[PDB]
Amino acid sequence: RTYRVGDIVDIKVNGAVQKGMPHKFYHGKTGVVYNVTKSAVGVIVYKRVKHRYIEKRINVRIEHVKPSRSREDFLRRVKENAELKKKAKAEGVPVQLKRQPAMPREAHTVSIADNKPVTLAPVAYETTI
Amino acid sequence: GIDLRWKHVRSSHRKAPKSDNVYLKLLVKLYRFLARRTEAPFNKVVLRRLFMSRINRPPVSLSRIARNLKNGNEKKTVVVVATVTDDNRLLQVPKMEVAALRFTAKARARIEAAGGRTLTLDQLALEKPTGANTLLLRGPKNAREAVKHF
Amino acid sequence: MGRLQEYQVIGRHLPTEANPNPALYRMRIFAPNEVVAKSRFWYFLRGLKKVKKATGEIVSVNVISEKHPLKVKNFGIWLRYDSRSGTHNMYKEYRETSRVAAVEAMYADMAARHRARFRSIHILKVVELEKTEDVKRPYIKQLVAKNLSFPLPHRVPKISTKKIFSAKRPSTFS
Amino acid sequence: IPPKPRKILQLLRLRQINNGVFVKVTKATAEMIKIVEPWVAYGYPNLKSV
Amino acid sequence: IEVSAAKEAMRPEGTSVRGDKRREIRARVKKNQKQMLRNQRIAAEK
RNA sequence: ACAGGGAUGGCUUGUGGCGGCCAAGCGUUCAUAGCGACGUCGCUUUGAUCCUUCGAUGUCGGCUCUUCCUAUCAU
RNA sequence: AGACUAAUCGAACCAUCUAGUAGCUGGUUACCGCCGAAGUUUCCCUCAGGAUAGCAGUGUCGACCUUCAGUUUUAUGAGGUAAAGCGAAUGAACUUUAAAUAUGUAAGAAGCCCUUGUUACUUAACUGAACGUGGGCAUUCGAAUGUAUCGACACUAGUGGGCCAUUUUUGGUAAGCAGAACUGGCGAUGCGGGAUGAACCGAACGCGGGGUUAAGGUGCCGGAGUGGACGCUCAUCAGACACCACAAAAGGCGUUAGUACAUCUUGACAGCAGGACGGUGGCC
RNA sequence: CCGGGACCGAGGACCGCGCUCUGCAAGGAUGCUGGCGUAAUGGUCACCAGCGACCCGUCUUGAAACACGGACCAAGGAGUCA
């Protein structure tokens, strides 16, 4: 994998080398590539101190760097927004183009004919004997 | 007690002129009435510019007016809430109708000699109470020694 | 631990494509109200069957009332309590008129005699002793004796606390 | 009060003690209310209460 | 490795921060070798 | 000489340290490890010798006089 | 003797330069109103060190236009770590699946692609990418919640390696403890309660009236119960705001509640009446 | 639905929303009555009572404590001019 300037990457220090490494803050951090080298890459990370963000620049080896999937879902939603919008225009019905938070469950009925409930004590008697 | 992380902000614009010019006070009263009783945004802009200080009202020269009179603006009335100055590099003054706070003597003489008209802002309020067919002009604000040394 | 009621609480894991009909689990919970009953149900179910509240749902909550609240009964309670040493069994007996009243008396007794709070007590079984021979403790055996009768020596009469002064010395014989 | 519960109360418009608001139940709001549980009491109001 | 933005700005293109220590070691070795060669030449002259 | 600034504590008490062993118990029982009181064992002149005194940075006293503590020398 | 030289001597007295200089010490004069702070952020040789970020107040101006946000949700990282199963395979390092806690990135018309060519990048390569060109997408502008929260200049001021505490982490001691990161409080702050008080709990403040509470309390001091229920405990200075130490697997013929094992009408535990013998005065 | 009690009466022609519509409890108190008409109400001063309440300024650090100034009164007395 050849990373490029402007790409968004994930930093994960893999292996047993994360035993006594000095700077573990950027493990699990995501940043933008600004400098590319054969075995190193330059990553811009932002640190939040109180009410303000401060830029930091790090040099990470390639084997601890993976490309990120941050904008994958956004570009995908833009895509099927375009095709389902075109399909709705073609067929002549409205369609939902906004993702919604999860709603409470509705009312339903559960039968106990073949699913008779099992009574539980706070401890299992099989463990007692 | 109530937690107000945000803060209510007092207004950061002038509500009245600092000047003690009584005729400026009369213009301020007239344009307060116009901006309250009309729907035209021109009157509100003129009232706001009447409130302003001198460094916020740079002079507008006859050459700047002549530049802005081009491209279908020849018949419009020029409105400058500032002093209109003369430009002697402009040899031919076109016929124009300018309303301004004040004119320099050469600017007024050259406009009248070219055959145009000079108005005050109260005459402008009489003839165009809604600011119809008007070209509103400002001078170069950043053209100042302080702004250059900023 | 309050005016307790006994609730039948039935819950289950949320249905999935793999398991369309999850098993239902039923518990008898002594609780002050339904919110506490459901919270204790999810606590015990997390401790037993590894079914979390987020992935589960309450199917039913019902109140179990005593069948005969006007009949005096003997109750055996098998419980476990946690102390600084660890977990200890107890079997204790209570002469009461309902399971909930026996459980309230149990909670009061455990707090008085062993300083155990509500959280460290696990009620494992509450039973009605069907026969008089099933009574194991002498403090209930003295009460289930034949022709039981006793007086009440040294009864302090009830005097209103707003009546500060009395003109006669009270008697302790009735 | 820590900054995250402070921000959640500010977004819930609970800026003073004994302030009450109506909230529609989604996951997006339920998680916020779960975070500010050390400062609020909430429940399901009926028609009379409304 | 944290690297200051001023160092990256002054750094020439192509060079990385991972070779700076080898660079300064090579410079120190070169200086020590020049001093050793100077002493060798002077001792041979004597 | 001048201008300034200053002047560990419910501590302690009667029984050594290091190294090994034993050990009731605690743990562990898909690993049999690890802790461990009580003890114990090793190092630190036939009543002798008197020809081996091993470093003040840290300061105590005396007089008069009263009271308290008990951790008791006497009664 | 640094002694004496008009009470003046390690340099007399008098006037002047002179209102000498001090970074050090002391002091620095009416009222009301509106805002309102701060302690290694980043760089420089340090202490007898500096700037600087950040935080504030007055003015203005610009369409006070764009909206943004110490928050949740969604997707995807870190944490695969618990857990379930292994009648799935294989064997924390097993995995179909999957934790709690907070945490990084992204979530639109300012956007998404497609096409056209160039390339001085790159690629085997007109190949990707960048650069531009043109076109298509407004049928919903593409989560929730909130939004008197905009931006840019100018000028001015204090503080910019302080104290305490929760959590996380790194070290230690015989025991103490010492560094960091975030957050909260204080310095700047009144009020109710902790009898009392820098660090505790509650709660933040214009002047008044009425109602209700919080923390804490209701035997008297003292406003409010000698309130109710079930128990436990008697201390030769109990206990009532404890958790730390003394302090141990500690010592108690104190008192209750349990657990385990054991004996018991084939007579248990305690006593009383009796037996307690022979080889045998076993061997040295 | 019906009682019992406490505190409060802001505004000052009409306008509005309404209702149980000759009117109203509907965008904020009126009606009736009594005593007094003055130190009666009210105010100021002295004192007692209950409750509350460290001596100010300065310095220091993070803060207290320490330290320094203060017998009393009048007048003078310190960010000015170029």
Could you give the C-alpha distances from C110 to A101, C14, C33, C81, in angstroms and in order?
Answer: 47, 37, 21, 9
Q: Are strands A118-119 and C24-31 parallel, antiparallel or unpaired?
A: parallel
Which string of DSSP letters, residue by residue, matches E1-46? -B--HHHHHHSPTT--GGGHHHHHHHHHHHHHHHHHHHHHHHHHH-
Nearest chain B alpha carbon to D16:
B2
Which token pair is A80? Answer: 């099927």
Residue of C19, C44, C53 to mutate, interface with A, max A Cβ within 10 Å: C44
Sheet with C24-31, side-by-side order of all strands = A118-119, C24-31, C5-13, C56-64
C30: chain A residues, CB-CB within 8 Å? none
Sign of the torsion formed by the C-alpha atoms of B97, B101, B103 and B109: positive
Nearest to C56 by CA among C19, C92, C14: C14
Tokens (6 digits) for C120: 């460290």
Q: Give the resolution to one decimal, in Å.
A: 2.6
What are phi and psi for residue C69, nearest 5 degrees?
-70, -10
Closest CA to C57 of C7, C10, C12: C12
Please name which of A1, A9, A69, A70 lies closest in space to residue A44, comparing C-alpha atoms. A9
The token pair at D48 is 């009379």
DSSP letters for B103-129: E-HHHHHHHHHHT-EEE-HHHHHHH-T
- State the alpha helices, DSSP H only, in A1-129: 72-91, 125-128
Chains E and A in direct contact, meaning 3 or more beta-carbon pairs closer than 8 angstroms: yes
Minimal CA–CA distance to C49: which of C25, C79, C29, C70? C25
Edge-to-edge order in the sheet of strand A8-11: A52-61, A40-49, A30-36, A8-11, A65-67
Q: Which residues pair with A61 in a beta bridge?
A: A40
- Among D27, D29, D31, D44, the residue to mutate for chain A (most A Cβ within 10 A): D27
3-class state of residue B136 by DSSP: strand
Q: Under a CB-based contact definition with an 8 Å cutoff, are residues C6 and C100 in contact? A: yes
Q: In the numeric block, which tokens belong to residue B143?
A: 């053209």
Which residue, among B98, B92, B81, B94, has the nearest Cα to B138 in the 3D structure?
Answer: B81
CA distance A21 to A11: 14
Alpha-carbon distance values, B100 to A124, B87, C163 (Å): 96, 16, 97
Q: Which bases of chain G are contacted by protein, using any atom under 7 A from a CB?
A: 34-36, 41-43, 54-55, 58-62, 64, 69-79, 82-84, 96, 99-100, 102-108, 111-113, 129, 137-155, 182-184, 203-205, 225-227, 229-232, 256-260
Long-range contacts of D33-39 (CB under 8 A, 24+ apart): D35/D4, D35/D5, D35/D8, D36/D5, D36/D8, D36/D9, D36/D12, D38/D5, D39/D1, D39/D5, D39/D9, D39/D14
- Cβ(B85)–Cβ(B105) below 8 Å: no
CA dihedral C156, C158, C163, C167 (to 10 degrees): -50
Helix (H, G, I), strand (E, B) or coil at C135: coil
Contact B2 D16 (CB under 8 A): yes
Output the CA torsion A19→A22→A28→A34 (10° steps): -140
Whether A57 and E18 lie within 8 Å, measured CB to CB: no
Cα separation, A29 vs A12, in Å, equals 8
The structure tokens listed for B39 are 């729907």
Which tokens hold the place of A98?
């906004």
The phi, psi pair for B24, rounded to 5°, reads -65, -35
